[PDB]
Amino acid sequence: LMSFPQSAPHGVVFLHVTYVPAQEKNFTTAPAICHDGKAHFPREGVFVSNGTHWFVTQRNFYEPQIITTDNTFVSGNCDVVIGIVNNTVYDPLQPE
Amino acid sequence: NGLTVLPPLLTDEMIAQYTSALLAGTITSGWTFGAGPALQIPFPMQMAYRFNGIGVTQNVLYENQKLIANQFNSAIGKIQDSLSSTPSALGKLQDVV
């Protein structure tokens, strides 16, 4: 994150402030989601599954969010990606 | 005549174990084993993270994983064949000795 210098006799001492993750949990992951016949890939994050539902969260922190159209992009069909799962993709335009 | 060579502290077995541990951490945790706890992650997702880091979308890997694995295997085989055939590959260590 950042470092603070400190003076020392014939030297220098750095106070390196680092980000160390902790309290990790296991989750089921999938490379892509197939809802409208085409595959979906996260722009920033990774798919996670708590056993019953699927969510999208960042890599360095657990923040489960609904799989919306704004968080993923469409590229190719579903019969190419190995390990793709079937899950619905929320579209913000339909309810509005 | 007094010239005596001392053996190193870490033997070849310990260096091999360290190398195997580094390799296992790299293939099972990506870059998280060095920054903190070893977070397990599939290799076809570590490769996707690497591609996203080099500026390539992850769909390229998710569509050409087979070709990329074949190219990696062929490259490893060619490296092994070059190390087996070319004797001057490790010339620096031999020159030091």
UniProtKB/Swiss-Prot annotation, chain B:
Effect of residue 4 to N: In strain: Lambda/C.37
Superkingdom of the source species: Viruses
Heptad repeat 1: annotated span: 65-97
Main function: Subunit of the fusion protein that is processed upon entry into the host cell. Mediates fusion of the virion and cellular membranes by functioning as a class I viral fusion protein. Contains a viral fusion peptide that is unmasked after S2 cleavage. This cleavage can occur at the cell membrane by host TMPRSS2 or during endocytosis by host CSTL. In either case, this triggers an extensive and irreversible conformational change that leads to fusion of the viral envelope with the cellular cytoplasmic membrane, releasing viral genomic RNA into the host cell cytoplasm.
Name by which UniProt lists this protein: Spike protein S2'
Gene source species: Severe acute respiratory syndrome coronavirus 2 (2019-nCoV)
Lineage: Viruses, Riboviria, Orthornavirae, Pisuviricota, Pisoniviricetes
Gene label: S
